[PDB]
Amino acid sequence: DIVMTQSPDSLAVSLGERATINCKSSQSVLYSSNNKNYLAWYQQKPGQPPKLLISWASTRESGVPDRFSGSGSGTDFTLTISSLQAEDVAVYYCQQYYSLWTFGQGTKVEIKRTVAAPSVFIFPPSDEQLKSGTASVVCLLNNFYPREAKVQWKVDNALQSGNSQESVTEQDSKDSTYSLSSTLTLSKADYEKHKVYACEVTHQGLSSPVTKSFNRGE
Amino acid sequence: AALGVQSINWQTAFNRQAHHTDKFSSQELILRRGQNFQVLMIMNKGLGSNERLEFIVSTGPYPSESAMTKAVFPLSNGSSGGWSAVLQASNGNTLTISISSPASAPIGRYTMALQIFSQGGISSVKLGTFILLFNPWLNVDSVFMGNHAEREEYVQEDAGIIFVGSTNRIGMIGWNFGQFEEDILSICLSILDRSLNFRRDAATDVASRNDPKYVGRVLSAMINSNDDNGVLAGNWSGTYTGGRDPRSWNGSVEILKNWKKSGFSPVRYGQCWVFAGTLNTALRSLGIPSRVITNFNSAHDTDRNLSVDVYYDPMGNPLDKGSDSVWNFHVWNEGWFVRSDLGPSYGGWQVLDATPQERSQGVFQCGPASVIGVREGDVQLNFDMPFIFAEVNADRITWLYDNTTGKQWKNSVNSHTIGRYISTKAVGSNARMDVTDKYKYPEGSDQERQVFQKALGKLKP
Amino acid sequence: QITLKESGPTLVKPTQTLTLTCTFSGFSLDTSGVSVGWIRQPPGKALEWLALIFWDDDKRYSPSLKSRLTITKDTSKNQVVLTMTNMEPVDTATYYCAHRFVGTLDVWGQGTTVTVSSASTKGPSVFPLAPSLGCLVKDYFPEPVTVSWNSGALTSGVHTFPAVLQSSGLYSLSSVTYICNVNHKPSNTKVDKRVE
Ligand SMILES: [Ca+2]
Ligand SMILES: [Ca+2]
Ligand SMILES: [Ca+2]
């Protein structure tokens, strides 16, 4: 197998600026016979299949904006986005098709943007759910940048651990923000044993931590 | 005195004229096998009834009665076939004697001795040496060619025409075969004595010189320098420093002489018509009727599939892939003989090619290939039939090759472009005779395509 | 007009044989030079080419997985079928089919998710997330689940979070009058839920 190794693994650039991605192959994909490089670039936006940008190292496919351009030969190739646009946020793979098909591991390209503090929201368990015997408390962090954020659950000021799970959105293709969800799961039994449920958030866009809490039974 | 021989008269000019060897510039007795010759042998006295003569003939360095490179035969009153001596007349002490060789005798130089038994004593005395050649005049010889006018062209003619140029525009050059010039027959016999076969096992090589198939194949090797320091070194480079430009030769005679006089060191340089010219001289000298063939758009098939392969990628780009090629023209030879190895239907013209193209059994040599066999696409028969069939009748196939999957598939076929205007000089003129129809059925017939499939079938036994 | 569409079981129990179909239009797999291929993508990982079939029934396979793989075509039904034996949890991935001609794999299908597990299908519970808004889609097996709001009328500002696999071996996710439309095709459980 020819081995495709991309670099970097992640890239954050400001709008309008140049983003470059290297790809390297374990062997040469220059076929001398026709003097063509058997090397493609793809773009995969989250939740879709991949989309071919460039074949033969440098030929753009139909409809691909000219801000995308491929260069390189042999074992060293480069995809260069000339003016990064909000919607260019995606994972880019290189692929050789000289000897069957192998892909690179992917490179995430994200928009660098000014810091944005999250909107925090907390949600008590549903009465429907309490019947089924479980209590899920939810915390929402809305429309922040950068991605790095810290969520801590406290129940009557006891710091929780073991019982919570988090989930983040992909960078918005419009405003280049993220959002985050944290889910604290207790048994109904445990839920009733305590009063104050708190969700403490540290984010760079907050000058100091913001805590949203609720009292059981409103 | 005991019976002894005083002198022998070989009647050289008489016998050479009868044996159609009188044209050679040479002092020697040159004979053809299977045909009697007459000598006068002057003894010291008349023969007694106690007295016996035995002739002994031998050829080559390890003569053997079993290998038929030695023969011992009494003077008798009756012909035996085989080697024989018949007393035709006594006149004083002179014996008139008719000596006969078999049609199956190995060709080459022979020694003759006489052994006399007289008064309870034995004497042996070397009588002389002669050259024995193939006999195209003799009905029972494998090289027999019954037509008078054709024999004159294919054996006795020492000037030739070789067709050259391209399939758009055929030219000609003259070639002086010169088989009758001084020393040339001698040099051509030399070639047989310097072959790899001879060096490995001279006793068996010499025994095999009764077979034109054998001699022909050997010559196809030995005319090229490759493997064996044969006669001609090939060079298609355009740079001929340290030798002659292949185009400056106009005959075989300088080449063969220069080979001998350099101590049998390859003559520099030849291309395909020079090999063929020189091979033709050798064949005619030894008495294998032969001629020179030119094939236009001649295929070099390097992978035994009867097609010249050309490659494109699926986007239509030409690929540097494959080693098959097509020559403007290529020149080779035909020799005339039966093929006892193949059967009655495969006699006649046999392809021999001295130009070093492909190794055959490890050696640059080629043929004999039955021209009849080639036309009928019996390419399983000896020798080199696949290669020769491709030369005249390869399809030209364009392939698509997808380098990613390693898959090739066939795009198009041109089944008529290879093998055009196959040409030999006409009997008794400088006309171009076309012999394309001898090598293949007609381009675009059903037969032509049937044979092509059949042939292809036999590559894959 | 070149479109490809994948289909088959979204759950396979270990040791059994996954069978995937690719139904295509806009081009013929009787055309010379044309090939359709299969690719898979394990969650949050790199793409992996599996197999390829040509118009003339020539096949190619990933060298490592060849012994397990079988690709076949039916030009009459505009279909390519992939068969993978001895399925194992690692083989959990999105599977794609794609068109090939003269360059590489150039037009792809939507993808179909395939989970390998001896666990059974379970449909989701859907609970409302009190506005004072969203809905919680809890304990569904296997992936995937599609969410919309007001039958697709409401799209702007909607965040549907990726699922999280819980300790229990079941998945869970949240989405942000308002009705959330949750479809879970593996259990045929399409549920529409009101929020307050
Ligand atoms: Ca040689
Ligand atoms: Ca070939
Ligand atoms: Ca033909």
Author numbering:
A (entry chain C): 1 to 218
B (entry chain A): 2 to 462
C (entry chain B): 1 to 132, 143 to 186, 198 to 217
Paper's wording?
Epitope 3 antibodies are characterized by usage of IGHV2-5 in combination with IGKV4-1. The crystal structure of TG3 in complex with an epitope 3 Fab (DH63-A02) unveils the mechanism underlying this phenomenon. To understand the effect of epitope 3 antibodies on TG3 activity, we solved the co-crystal structure of an epitope 3 Fab (DH63-A02) bound to cleaved TG3 with or without a substrate-mimicking inhibitor attached to Cys273 in the active site. Except for the presence or absence of the peptide inhibitor, the two structures are virtually identical (RMSD of Cα atoms 0.52 Å), and the C-terminal domains are lacking from both. The structures reveal that DH63-A02 binds to the critical catalytic core β-sheet and that its epitope does not overlap with the previously characterized epitope of DH63-B02 (epitope 2). With the exception of Leu100 in CDR-L3, all heavy and light chain residues that are involved in electrostatic interactions with TG3 are germline encoded. The identified Fab-TG3 interactions thus explain the selective usage of IGHV2-5/IGKV4-1 among anti-TG3 epitope 3 antibodies. The structures of DH63-A02 bound to cleaved TG3 predict a clash between DH63-A02 and the C1 domain if the C1C2 fragment had still been present. Similar complexes were not observed with epitope 1 or epitope 2 Fab, suggesting that binding to epitope 3 is required for zymogen TG3 to display low-level transamidation activity. This effect is likely explained by a Fab-induced move of the C-terminal domains to uncover the active site, since the catalytic core β-sheet and the C1 domain will be forced apart, when an antibody binds to epitope 3. Collectively, the structures of TG3 with bound DH63-A02 demonstrate that the antibody autonomously triggers the conformational changes associated with TG3 activation, thus explaining why epitope 3 antibodies enhance the catalytic activity of the enzyme.
